[PDB]
Tab-separated table of C-alpha atoms in Angstrom:
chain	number	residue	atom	x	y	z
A	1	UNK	CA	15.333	-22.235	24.530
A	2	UNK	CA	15.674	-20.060	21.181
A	3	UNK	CA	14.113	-23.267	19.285
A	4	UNK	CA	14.600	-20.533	16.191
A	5	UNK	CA	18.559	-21.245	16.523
A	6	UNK	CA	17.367	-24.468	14.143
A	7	UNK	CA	16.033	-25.156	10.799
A	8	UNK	CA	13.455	-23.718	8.805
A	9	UNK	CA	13.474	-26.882	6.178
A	10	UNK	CA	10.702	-26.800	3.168
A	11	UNK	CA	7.548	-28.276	4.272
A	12	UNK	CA	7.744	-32.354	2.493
A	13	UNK	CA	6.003	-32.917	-0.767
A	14	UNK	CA	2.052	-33.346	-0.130
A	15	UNK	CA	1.548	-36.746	1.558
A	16	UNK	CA	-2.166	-37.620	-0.721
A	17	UNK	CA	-1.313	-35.433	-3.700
A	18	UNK	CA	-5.073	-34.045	-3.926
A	19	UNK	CA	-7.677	-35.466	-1.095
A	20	UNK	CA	-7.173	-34.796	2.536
A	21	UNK	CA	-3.901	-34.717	2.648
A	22	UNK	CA	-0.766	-33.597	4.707
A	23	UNK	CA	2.689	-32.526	4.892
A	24	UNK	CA	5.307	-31.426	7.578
A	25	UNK	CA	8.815	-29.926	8.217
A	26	UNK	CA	11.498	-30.702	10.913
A	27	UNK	CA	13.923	-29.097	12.649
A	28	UNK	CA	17.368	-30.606	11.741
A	29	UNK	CA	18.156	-30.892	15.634
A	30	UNK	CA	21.758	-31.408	16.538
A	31	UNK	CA	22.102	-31.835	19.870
A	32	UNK	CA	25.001	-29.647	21.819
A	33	UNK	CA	25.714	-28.779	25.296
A	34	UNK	CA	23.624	-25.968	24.275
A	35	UNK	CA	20.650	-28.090	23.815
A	36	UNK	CA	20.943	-30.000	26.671
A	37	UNK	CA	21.609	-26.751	29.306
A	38	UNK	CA	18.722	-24.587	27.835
A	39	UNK	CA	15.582	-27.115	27.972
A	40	UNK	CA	15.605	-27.464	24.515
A	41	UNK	CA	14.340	-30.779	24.481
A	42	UNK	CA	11.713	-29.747	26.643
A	43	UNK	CA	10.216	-26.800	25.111
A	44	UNK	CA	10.745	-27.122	21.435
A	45	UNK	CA	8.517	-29.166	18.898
A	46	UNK	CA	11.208	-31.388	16.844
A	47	UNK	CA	8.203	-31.688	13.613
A	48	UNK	CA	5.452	-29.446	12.847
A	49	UNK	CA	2.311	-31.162	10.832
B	436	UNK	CA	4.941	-24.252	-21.947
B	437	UNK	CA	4.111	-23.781	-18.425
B	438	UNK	CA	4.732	-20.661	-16.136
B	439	UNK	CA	6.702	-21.352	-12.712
B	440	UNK	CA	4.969	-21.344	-9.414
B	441	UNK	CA	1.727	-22.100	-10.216
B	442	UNK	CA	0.994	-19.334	-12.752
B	443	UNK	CA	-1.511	-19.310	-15.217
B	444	UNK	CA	-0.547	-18.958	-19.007
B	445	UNK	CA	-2.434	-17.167	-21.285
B	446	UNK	CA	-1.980	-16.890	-25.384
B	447	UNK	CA	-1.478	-12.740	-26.317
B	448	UNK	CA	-2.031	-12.808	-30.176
B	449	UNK	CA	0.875	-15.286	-31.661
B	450	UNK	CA	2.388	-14.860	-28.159
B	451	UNK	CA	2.467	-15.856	-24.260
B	452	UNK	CA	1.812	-14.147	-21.315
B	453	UNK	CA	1.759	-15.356	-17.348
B	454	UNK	CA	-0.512	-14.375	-14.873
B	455	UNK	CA	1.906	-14.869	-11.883
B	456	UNK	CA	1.256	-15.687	-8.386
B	457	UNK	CA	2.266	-12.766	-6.020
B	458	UNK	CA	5.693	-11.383	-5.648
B	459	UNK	CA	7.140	-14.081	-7.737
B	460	UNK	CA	8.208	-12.570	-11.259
B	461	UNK	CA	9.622	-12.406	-14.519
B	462	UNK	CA	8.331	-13.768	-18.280
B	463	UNK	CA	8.395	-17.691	-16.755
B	464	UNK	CA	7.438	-16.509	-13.079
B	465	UNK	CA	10.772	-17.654	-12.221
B	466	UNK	CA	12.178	-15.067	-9.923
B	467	UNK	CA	11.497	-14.277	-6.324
B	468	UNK	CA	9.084	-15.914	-3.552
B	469	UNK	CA	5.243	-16.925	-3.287
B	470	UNK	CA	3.119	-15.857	-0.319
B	471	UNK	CA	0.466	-17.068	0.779
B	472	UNK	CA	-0.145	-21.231	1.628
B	473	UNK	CA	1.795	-23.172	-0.462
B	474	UNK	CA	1.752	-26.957	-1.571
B	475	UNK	CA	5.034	-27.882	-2.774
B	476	UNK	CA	5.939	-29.738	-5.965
B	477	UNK	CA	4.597	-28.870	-9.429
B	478	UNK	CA	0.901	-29.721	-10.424
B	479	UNK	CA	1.105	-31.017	-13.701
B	480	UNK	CA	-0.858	-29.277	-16.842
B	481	UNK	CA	-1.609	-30.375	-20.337
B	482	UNK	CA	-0.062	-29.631	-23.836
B	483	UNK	CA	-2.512	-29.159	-26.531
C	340	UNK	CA	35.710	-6.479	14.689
C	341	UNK	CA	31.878	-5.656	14.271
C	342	UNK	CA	29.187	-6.559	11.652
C	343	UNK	CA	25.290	-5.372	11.906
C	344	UNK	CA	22.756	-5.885	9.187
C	345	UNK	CA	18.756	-4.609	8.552
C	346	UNK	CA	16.066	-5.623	5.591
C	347	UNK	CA	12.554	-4.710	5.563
C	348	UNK	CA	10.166	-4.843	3.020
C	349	UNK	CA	6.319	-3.840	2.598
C	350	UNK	CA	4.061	-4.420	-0.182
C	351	UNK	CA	0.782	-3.583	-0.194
C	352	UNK	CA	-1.879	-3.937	-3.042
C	353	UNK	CA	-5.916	-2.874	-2.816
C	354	UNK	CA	-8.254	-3.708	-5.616
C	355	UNK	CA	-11.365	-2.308	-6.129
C	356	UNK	CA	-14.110	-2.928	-8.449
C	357	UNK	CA	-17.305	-0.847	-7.926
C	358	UNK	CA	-17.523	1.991	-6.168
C	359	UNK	CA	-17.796	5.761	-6.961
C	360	UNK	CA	-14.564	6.895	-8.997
C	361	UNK	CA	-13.674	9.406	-5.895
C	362	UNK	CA	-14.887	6.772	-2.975
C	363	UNK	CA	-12.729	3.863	-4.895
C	364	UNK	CA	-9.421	6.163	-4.984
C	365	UNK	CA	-9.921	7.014	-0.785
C	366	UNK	CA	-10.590	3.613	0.296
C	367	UNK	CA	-7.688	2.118	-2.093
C	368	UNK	CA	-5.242	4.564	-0.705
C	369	UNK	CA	-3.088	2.472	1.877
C	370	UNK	CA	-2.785	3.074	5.372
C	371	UNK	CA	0.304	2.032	7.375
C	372	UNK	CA	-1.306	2.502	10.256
C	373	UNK	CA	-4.344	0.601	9.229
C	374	UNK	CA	-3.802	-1.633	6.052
C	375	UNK	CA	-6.997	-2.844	5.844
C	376	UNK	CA	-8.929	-0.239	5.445
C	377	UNK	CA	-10.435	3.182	7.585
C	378	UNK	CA	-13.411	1.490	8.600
C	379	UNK	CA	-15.692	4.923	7.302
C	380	UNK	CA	-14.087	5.142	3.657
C	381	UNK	CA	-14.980	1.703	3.565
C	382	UNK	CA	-18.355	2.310	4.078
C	383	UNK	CA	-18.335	5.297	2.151
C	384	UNK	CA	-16.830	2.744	-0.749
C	385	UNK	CA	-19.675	0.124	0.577
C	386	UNK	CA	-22.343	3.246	-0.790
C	387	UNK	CA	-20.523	4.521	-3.531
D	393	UNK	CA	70.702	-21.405	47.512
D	394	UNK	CA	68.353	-22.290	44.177
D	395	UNK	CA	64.561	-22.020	44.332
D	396	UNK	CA	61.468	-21.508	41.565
D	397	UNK	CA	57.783	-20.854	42.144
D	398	UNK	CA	55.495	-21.049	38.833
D	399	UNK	CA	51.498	-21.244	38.287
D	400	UNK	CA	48.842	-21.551	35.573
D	401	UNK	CA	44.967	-20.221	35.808
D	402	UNK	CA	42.216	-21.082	33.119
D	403	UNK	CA	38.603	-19.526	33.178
D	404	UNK	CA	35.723	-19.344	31.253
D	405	UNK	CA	32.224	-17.922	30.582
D	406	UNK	CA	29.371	-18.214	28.503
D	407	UNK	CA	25.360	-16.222	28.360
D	408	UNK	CA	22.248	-16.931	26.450
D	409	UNK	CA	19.195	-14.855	25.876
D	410	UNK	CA	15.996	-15.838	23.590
D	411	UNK	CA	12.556	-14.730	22.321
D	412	UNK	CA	10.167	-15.395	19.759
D	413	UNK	CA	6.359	-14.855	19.424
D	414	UNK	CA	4.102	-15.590	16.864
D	415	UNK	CA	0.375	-14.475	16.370
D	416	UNK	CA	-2.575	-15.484	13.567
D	417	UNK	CA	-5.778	-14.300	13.017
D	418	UNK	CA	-8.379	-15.082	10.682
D	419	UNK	CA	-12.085	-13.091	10.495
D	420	UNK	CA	-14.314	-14.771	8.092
D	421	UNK	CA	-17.669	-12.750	7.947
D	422	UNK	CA	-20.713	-13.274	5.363
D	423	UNK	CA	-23.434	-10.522	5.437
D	424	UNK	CA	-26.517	-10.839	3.876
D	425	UNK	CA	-29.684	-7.872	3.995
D	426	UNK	CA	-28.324	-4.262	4.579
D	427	UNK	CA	-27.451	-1.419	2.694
D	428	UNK	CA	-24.278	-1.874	1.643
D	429	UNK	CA	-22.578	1.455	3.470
D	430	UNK	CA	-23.361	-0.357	6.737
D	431	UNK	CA	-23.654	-3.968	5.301
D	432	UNK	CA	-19.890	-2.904	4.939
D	433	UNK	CA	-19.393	-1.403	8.163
């Protein structure tokens, strides 16, 4: 798949605003034939952490 | 009254200055993109 | 009906404090090929 | 004599072709003792 066909959203506001903490992005996945043809679901991560 | 992404203020005589973060520009630091990590949000800072 | 588009951008930005005023001005000068430094004016810097 | 042949064809095609890499580094180095000529090198 060209998993870069989808969304580079802003990563979410800091989860623990100064200890520790975390955030992560997602890719906005709509699903099209597409998707389903070119092992997108397969290969691609749907959130990075 | 604070600079945009994450720059630091500092008083010129009777005047303000901002020592921007990199590439991103301009009296406020409003203009053009950080580099570097990033945190999102705004980190708040004190009036005096 | 055809469309292309291209963008690139460098910036580049060495710092030096220390360093013999000739020895500073080599290892600050940026390589393309090499932006972090030529490993021998850095050491030349490193004594200076 | 009357007489009338007709037809209609439909076709269709479609290709795909990706890439992407992506590469990080990070050196983190602390030197203490040397002279400082090779303490950089």
């Amino acid at each position: 798949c060209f998993c870069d066909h989808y969304a580079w959203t802003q990563w979410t506001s800091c989860s623990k605003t100064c200890n520790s903490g975390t955030q992560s992005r997602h890719r906005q996945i709509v699903v099209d034939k597409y998707y389903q043809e070119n092992f997108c679901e397969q290969i691609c991560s749907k959130q990075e952490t | 009254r604070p600079c945009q992404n994450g720059g630091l203020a500092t008083v010129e005589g009777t005047h303000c200055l901002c020592h921007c973060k990199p590439y991103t520009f301009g009296a406020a630091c409003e203009q053009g993109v950080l580099v570097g990590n990033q945190a999102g949000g705004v980190d708040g800072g004190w009036s005096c | 009906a055809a469309s292309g588009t291209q963008n690139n951008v460098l910036r580049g930005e060495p710092f030096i404090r220390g360093g013999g005023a000739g020895f500073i001005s080599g290892l600050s000068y940026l390589e393309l090929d090499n932006p972090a430094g030529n490993k021998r004016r850095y050491s030349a810097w490193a004594e200076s | 004599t009357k007489v009338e042949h007709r037809c209609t064809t439909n076709k269709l095609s479609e290709k795909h072709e990706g890439s992407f890499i992506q590469g990080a580094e990070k050196s983190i180095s602390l030197i203490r003792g040397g002279r400082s000529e090779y303490g950089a090198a």
